[PDB]
Design a protein around this nucleic acid. Sequence first.
RNA 1: GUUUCUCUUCAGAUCGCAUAAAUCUUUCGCCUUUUACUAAAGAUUUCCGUGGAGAGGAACACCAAUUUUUUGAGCCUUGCCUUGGCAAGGCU
Lengths: 157, 83, 49, 49, 73, 379
Amino acid sequence: TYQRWQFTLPMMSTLYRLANQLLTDLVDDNYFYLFDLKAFFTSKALNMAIPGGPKFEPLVREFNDINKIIIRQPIRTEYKIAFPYLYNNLPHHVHLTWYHTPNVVFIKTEDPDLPAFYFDPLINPISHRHSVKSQEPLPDDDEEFELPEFVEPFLKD
Amino acid sequence: MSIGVPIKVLHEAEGHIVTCETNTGEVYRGKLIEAEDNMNCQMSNITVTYRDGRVAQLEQVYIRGSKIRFLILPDMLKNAPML
Amino acid sequence: MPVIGKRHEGKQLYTFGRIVIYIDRGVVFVQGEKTWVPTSLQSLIDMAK
Amino acid sequence: DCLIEQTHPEIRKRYDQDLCYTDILFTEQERGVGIKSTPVTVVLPDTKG
Amino acid sequence: AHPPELKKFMDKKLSLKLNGGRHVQGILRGFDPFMNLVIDECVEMATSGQQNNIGMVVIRGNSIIMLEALERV
Amino acid sequence: TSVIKIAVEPVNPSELPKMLDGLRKVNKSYPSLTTKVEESGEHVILGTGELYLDCVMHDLRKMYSEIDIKVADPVVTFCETVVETSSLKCFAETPNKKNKITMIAEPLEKGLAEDIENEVVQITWNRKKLGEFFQTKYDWDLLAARSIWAFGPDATGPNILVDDTLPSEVDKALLGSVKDSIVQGFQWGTREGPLCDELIRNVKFKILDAVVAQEPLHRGGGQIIPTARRVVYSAFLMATPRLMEPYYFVEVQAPADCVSAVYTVLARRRGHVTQDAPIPGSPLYTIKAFIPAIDSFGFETDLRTHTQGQAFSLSVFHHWQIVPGDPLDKSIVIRPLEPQPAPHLAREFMIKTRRRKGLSEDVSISKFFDDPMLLELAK
RNA sequence: GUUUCUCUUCAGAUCGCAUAAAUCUUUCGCCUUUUACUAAAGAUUUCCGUGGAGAGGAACACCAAUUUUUUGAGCCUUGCCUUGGCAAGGCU
């Protein structure tokens, strides 16, 4: 019936790079900020377009004193997608967009010769080295502490 | 190691008020502070009953483990997740 | 004088002599026992002496 | 969440998705940004038990 | 670990009440895992209240049935 | 401080009592929220920033009211300050003409205004301890430093009232009877301010004469208190008044190749950059910058779009800084739809705020100054 | 016990990390007319597939050294208690 599949990791690690021409190398979903499915819905529930997004037939078919308005910057259409209850009136059927995710920081090792854990040059060198060297409560040398015969680092073998 | 259920309930007893009677017959009644795995207790703020009747108050006391022959743990512990 | 640190409906409260008032673009409302009463300027004066 | 999961045996995370336990508002879950200070009371053991 | 948590009490002034109805009062500095104490400025409280002075003494652990502070931690 | 200001009106005036019910309910929910109705009858909401107000407006609409509400554009609160010493000694005479008060206004010496908001010094302290603080840190004359009477507009407000009158020229006992009334008017005047009904900041006031009536009726209240307010306004207007805009502090994470794009977006919005450093043990770079809060609207959405979502920015409230331009420059013409040139900004902001407040377009100097002092201004 | 095939029942679920058509009510548009349409909303069904459970078939198959357990034991004298014993105290 061919319903369920279960593969080892050397198989998957090969199939991934055969497919590599089709796939896109985005590591995280931060790219689609106002370019995901939810953002377009806001652009359809309002009658107002995102610059690169798709277009639709619209769903439908003193206070306004301009002299009191400080037009410091234009209210660029993206802003009404991002905060649809503030920069906008009558937000009926509007969707809140997913705000952020932390930047996935993954460093692609180019060649397999290098050790898997190594300080890859793209990563900024840690400048820190204790200059004003602190004297935190480190116990004195030979102060009656010794381990039993057979304790070791857990996975040392 | 298998330090069983009673001594865990002793640790659970700390910070309350326990009564504690020694071989000689002195009865202590005091607020617990710490208790060790061999039942050495420290106790605070005690009202002690002597063997013959007399009361006295005390600042702080430390009671050797093997010298006890009951404690009266405070009843609410019967619910505790040791049991 | 303004009633420092106290406001009613976000409007700034002022004292007018012994009377507590707020102004709503010129209407004088005097603090009565449980309600604000719109008050003429003349009657404000003659209650504040 | 990891405290609650430790404390409440019937409650488990979904494999695909975080169990934002204190994010009780739809608004708060839709944004993915916590907006209300939500208190939790639990008893949980020390190393001593 | 095995030692008593007696670390607090050190250099403060103790009374002890010893097996067999005996009493001694002390300024403390010793303990080992058996609770063997080393007491300093050690007074012996005889039955009649006739008091002796005696110098630095060891106590066997099992002889104690209480250990009380005459001036606080 | 909840610096960002939006205004609301209900789409149907008959529904307005329902809206008020909504406003009271959100006020409980959000601690730093402030809801105020100004003399123009605008309903005003104050908020710490963009996403904060966005959630407030959601809850007002969907959770409590379920009515249609119009939302005005975001605006920032401004502050009023002086940059130079008063050109003329300004005096005011009370309406009964039996009392005469003279004051001058000067700036608080670049720093003291911050310290008072940090509660580093307090008027509950004894005058000796007060005197020692001002003399040691700021090199005040001890005679001046002992002669401190109040902070304004509140007990930790950024303005100080000083009595510089000599006991040989003004009876300190007679002055002491009217002392408390002066303080009250001083706090009041700093609260309102004469330019656009916004707070007075960083101003040191010295009294340099006081004529006081011997009869209690003529002193000590109704005469003194508005007159005290008026003289404060006259002194302020002659001391080259300026507006202060609020600046935000911004921190941005970005990969190295995106750093140049961050600079570009800030340059549009009058931003200034103050640090840019690699965070150790990561590829990302921190950038740090000041930006003016009125220019900040939409900045996050700009920065993330130009950098393909890689950058991200948080913003927080930080110092006031003086707005370029002169708010009293009658020569400037403000042309309604344009983003005005920078020298005009002080003129623009003053006018439009007053319009929003419903005040007269230009400050009738005659209103606060007595006729002899107007003659003095004419001379 | 693993696979298979068939039947029954419940489906809350990205029943599906995929995505079709039809009917009706309205707002539209080209429009002689009508299908066939357009493109938005709502109520609806049809179709390609799916999961859970159950039934039945078929095919291959260890320490006595103070902190508890290898004991400071045991013996007397006073008061009360009707007696019995209790409160102790003193010994080796």
